[PDB]
Amino acid sequence: MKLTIIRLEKFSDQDRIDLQKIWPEYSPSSLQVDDNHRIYAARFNERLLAAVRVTLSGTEGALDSLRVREVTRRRGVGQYLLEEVLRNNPGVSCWWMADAGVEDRGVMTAFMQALGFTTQQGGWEKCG
Numbered sequence: 838m839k840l841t842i843i844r845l846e847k848f849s850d851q852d853r854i855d856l857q858k859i860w861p862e863y864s865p866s867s868l869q870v871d872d873n874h875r876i877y878a879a880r881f882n883e884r885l886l887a888a889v890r891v892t893l894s895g896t897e898g899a900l901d902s903l904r905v906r907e908v909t910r911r912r913g914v915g916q917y918l919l920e921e922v923l924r925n926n927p928g929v930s931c932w933w934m935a936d937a938g939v940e941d942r943g944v945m946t947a948f949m950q951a952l953g954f955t956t957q958q959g960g961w962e963k964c965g
């Protein structure tokens with residue numbers, strides 16, 4: 838079982854629907870990425886199991902939003918994905934994770950602490 842993390846360089850209307858299924862509060866924008874704003878899609882067996890948006894502004898890593906499917910509250914997928922990103926993106930020493938006003942942040946921080954992130958003055962930081 839390997840989580841296939843794909844980079845969303847092109848958005849079909851099929852992807853469009855499933856993305857809105859992951860973010861039911863998000864009105865369908867243009868869905869437009871660049872070499873900095875990089876949206877990665879973790880598809881486990883063809884289907885979206887997790888979605889994360891990382892804005893690599895230069896060599897700085899800004900992690901905004903991350904949603905794994907609700908049922909996947911413990912299946913390695915989340916940490917696997919985060920580690921995978923940090924293992925395939927070298928040089929980026931400053932990983933900054935936004936809180937995004939998430940209320941499941943209690944659970945999120947528990948995930949963060951057990952994975953290897955620290956909370957500093959308004960968000961999670963991982964310099965390394």
Ligand SMILES: CC(C)(COP(=O)(O)OP(=O)(O)OC[C@H]1O[C@@H](n2cnc3c(N)ncnc32)[C@H](O)[C@@H]1OP(=O)(O)O)[C@@H](O)C(=O)NCCC(=O)NCCS
Pocket residue numbers: 901902903904905906907909910911912913914915916917937939941944945947948949951952
């Ligand atoms: C929270 C969430 C990431 C758990 O997803 P996941 O892919 O199962 O995460 P993992 O399986 O990698 O993490 C389980 C590990 O995280 C840590 N952890 C601690 N508390 C945890 C918790 N309450 N839930 C999940 N992981 C937790 C542990 O180290 C655990 O390791 P273990 O399985 O060996 O015990 C998933 O439910 C999710 O993404 N939901 C929220 C998406 C969302 O709405 N986010 C807002 C973006 S605005």
